[PDB]
Amino acid sequence: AFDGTWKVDRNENYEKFMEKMGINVVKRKLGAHDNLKLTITQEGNKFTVKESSNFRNIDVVFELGVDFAYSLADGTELTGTWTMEGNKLVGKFKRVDNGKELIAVREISGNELIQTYTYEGVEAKRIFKK
Protein backbone atom coordinates (compact mmCIF):
# COMPACT_ATOMS: atom_id res chain seq x y z
CA ALA A 1 0.00 0.00 0.00
CA PHE A 2 3.02 2.22 0.69
CA ASP A 3 4.70 1.13 -2.56
CA GLY A 4 5.96 3.64 -5.06
CA THR A 5 7.86 6.88 -5.43
CA TRP A 6 6.87 9.63 -3.05
CA LYS A 7 7.94 13.24 -3.32
CA VAL A 8 7.51 15.65 -0.47
CA ASP A 9 4.73 18.19 -1.14
CA ARG A 10 4.36 20.16 2.10
CA ASN A 11 5.28 20.24 5.77
CA GLU A 12 3.47 21.00 8.99
CA ASN A 13 5.44 22.27 11.95
CA TYR A 14 8.69 20.85 10.61
CA GLU A 15 10.86 23.84 11.55
CA LYS A 16 9.79 23.65 15.20
CA PHE A 17 10.44 19.91 15.19
CA MET A 18 13.94 20.44 13.79
CA GLU A 19 14.59 23.11 16.38
CA LYS A 20 13.58 20.66 19.11
CA MET A 21 15.97 18.09 17.65
CA GLY A 22 18.76 20.68 18.03
CA ILE A 23 19.15 21.70 14.41
CA ASN A 24 20.53 25.22 13.82
CA VAL A 25 18.61 27.89 11.84
CA VAL A 26 20.56 27.54 8.55
CA LYS A 27 20.16 23.75 8.55
CA ARG A 28 16.44 24.12 9.44
CA LYS A 29 15.96 26.32 6.43
CA LEU A 30 17.78 23.77 4.26
CA GLY A 31 15.81 20.93 5.83
CA ALA A 32 12.51 22.70 5.03
CA HIS A 33 13.39 22.37 1.34
CA ASP A 34 15.32 19.11 1.28
CA ASN A 35 13.52 17.67 -1.77
CA LEU A 36 12.99 14.45 0.18
CA LYS A 37 11.93 11.58 -2.06
CA LEU A 38 11.16 8.08 -0.81
CA THR A 39 11.06 5.11 -3.16
CA ILE A 40 9.37 2.34 -1.17
CA THR A 41 9.03 -1.33 -2.10
CA GLN A 42 7.43 -3.88 0.24
CA GLU A 43 8.08 -7.63 -0.09
CA GLY A 44 6.23 -9.61 2.58
CA ASN A 45 7.17 -7.92 5.84
CA LYS A 46 10.34 -6.50 4.34
CA PHE A 47 10.77 -2.97 3.05
CA THR A 48 13.39 -1.22 1.02
CA VAL A 49 13.28 2.56 1.16
CA LYS A 50 15.52 4.62 -1.11
CA GLU A 51 15.89 7.94 0.69
CA SER A 52 16.95 10.82 -1.60
CA SER A 53 17.31 14.40 -0.47
CA ASN A 54 19.68 17.33 -0.81
CA PHE A 55 21.50 15.99 2.27
CA ARG A 56 22.06 12.44 1.06
CA ASN A 57 20.97 9.52 -1.07
CA ILE A 58 20.88 6.29 0.97
CA ASP A 59 19.16 2.92 0.79
CA VAL A 60 17.37 1.65 3.92
CA VAL A 61 16.31 -1.96 4.35
CA PHE A 62 14.23 -3.15 7.29
CA GLU A 63 11.99 -6.00 8.31
CA LEU A 64 8.83 -5.37 10.34
CA GLY A 65 9.47 -6.07 14.02
CA VAL A 66 13.26 -6.26 13.67
CA ASP A 67 15.51 -3.65 15.31
CA PHE A 68 17.95 -1.83 13.01
CA ALA A 69 20.38 1.13 13.15
CA TYR A 70 19.85 4.29 11.11
CA SER A 71 21.87 7.48 10.95
CA LEU A 72 20.33 10.91 10.41
CA ALA A 73 21.74 13.56 8.01
CA ASP A 74 24.23 14.87 10.58
CA GLY A 75 25.41 11.44 11.75
CA THR A 76 23.08 11.25 14.76
CA GLU A 77 22.42 7.54 15.23
CA LEU A 78 19.05 5.97 15.91
CA THR A 79 18.08 2.42 16.73
CA GLY A 80 14.52 1.17 16.45
CA THR A 81 11.85 -0.83 14.73
CA TRP A 82 9.01 -0.32 12.23
CA THR A 83 5.82 -2.28 12.92
CA MET A 84 2.43 -2.32 11.17
CA GLU A 85 -0.31 -1.04 13.45
CA GLY A 86 -3.62 -1.36 11.65
CA ASN A 87 -2.99 0.32 8.31
CA LYS A 88 -0.19 2.57 9.74
CA LEU A 89 3.56 2.04 9.82
CA VAL A 90 4.81 2.98 13.30
CA GLY A 91 8.56 3.55 13.71
CA LYS A 92 9.73 3.48 17.32
CA PHE A 93 13.27 4.85 17.50
CA LYS A 94 15.66 6.12 20.12
CA ARG A 95 18.54 8.50 19.72
CA VAL A 96 21.77 6.73 20.66
CA ASP A 97 23.34 9.98 21.92
CA ASN A 98 20.69 10.84 24.55
CA GLY A 99 18.37 7.83 24.67
CA LYS A 100 15.30 9.91 23.78
CA GLU A 101 12.43 8.52 21.77
CA LEU A 102 11.84 9.65 18.20
CA ILE A 103 8.68 8.24 16.60
CA ALA A 104 7.75 8.24 12.92
CA VAL A 105 4.37 7.20 11.61
CA ARG A 106 3.53 6.50 8.00
CA GLU A 107 -0.01 6.46 6.72
CA ILE A 108 -1.89 6.68 3.46
CA SER A 109 -4.52 9.40 3.46
CA GLY A 110 -6.29 9.37 0.11
CA ASN A 111 -3.59 9.83 -2.53
CA GLU A 112 -0.97 11.15 -0.07
CA LEU A 113 1.60 9.54 2.25
CA ILE A 114 1.57 11.28 5.61
CA GLN A 115 4.83 10.93 7.53
CA THR A 116 4.46 12.20 11.09
CA TYR A 117 7.33 12.68 13.54
CA THR A 118 7.25 13.09 17.29
CA TYR A 119 10.11 14.12 19.52
CA GLU A 120 9.94 15.42 23.09
CA GLY A 121 6.33 16.45 22.68
CA VAL A 122 6.71 18.24 19.35
CA GLU A 123 4.91 16.95 16.23
CA ALA A 124 5.73 17.47 12.57
CA LYS A 125 4.26 16.14 9.36
CA ARG A 126 5.80 15.73 5.95
CA ILE A 127 3.17 15.00 3.35
CA PHE A 128 4.14 13.30 0.09
CA LYS A 129 2.43 12.94 -3.28
CA LYS A 130 3.09 9.96 -5.55
Ligand SMILES: CN(C)c1cccc2c(S(=O)(=O)NCCCCCCCCCCC(=O)O)cccc12
Ligand atom coordinates in the same frame (compact mmCIF):
# COMPACT_ATOMS: atom_id res chain seq x y z
C1 LIG B 1 21.60 18.19 7.70
N1 LIG B 1 21.05 18.14 9.05
C2 LIG B 1 21.92 18.56 10.14
C3 LIG B 1 19.70 17.99 9.34
C4 LIG B 1 18.81 18.85 8.70
C5 LIG B 1 17.43 18.85 8.98
C6 LIG B 1 16.87 17.97 9.92
C7 LIG B 1 17.70 17.09 10.62
C8 LIG B 1 17.15 16.15 11.64
S1 LIG B 1 15.57 16.09 12.01
O1 LIG B 1 15.38 15.09 13.02
O2 LIG B 1 15.08 17.38 12.41
N2 LIG B 1 14.73 15.57 10.75
C9 LIG B 1 14.89 14.22 10.24
C10 LIG B 1 13.91 13.24 10.90
C11 LIG B 1 14.04 11.85 10.29
C12 LIG B 1 13.37 10.78 11.15
C13 LIG B 1 13.55 9.43 10.44
C14 LIG B 1 12.69 8.31 11.03
C15 LIG B 1 13.35 6.93 10.84
C16 LIG B 1 13.47 6.51 9.38
C17 LIG B 1 13.94 5.06 9.28
C18 LIG B 1 14.17 4.61 7.84
C19 LIG B 1 12.92 4.60 6.99
O3 LIG B 1 11.99 3.85 7.31
O4 LIG B 1 12.84 5.35 5.98
C20 LIG B 1 18.08 15.33 12.31
C21 LIG B 1 19.44 15.35 12.02
C22 LIG B 1 20.00 16.19 11.08
C23 LIG B 1 19.16 17.07 10.37
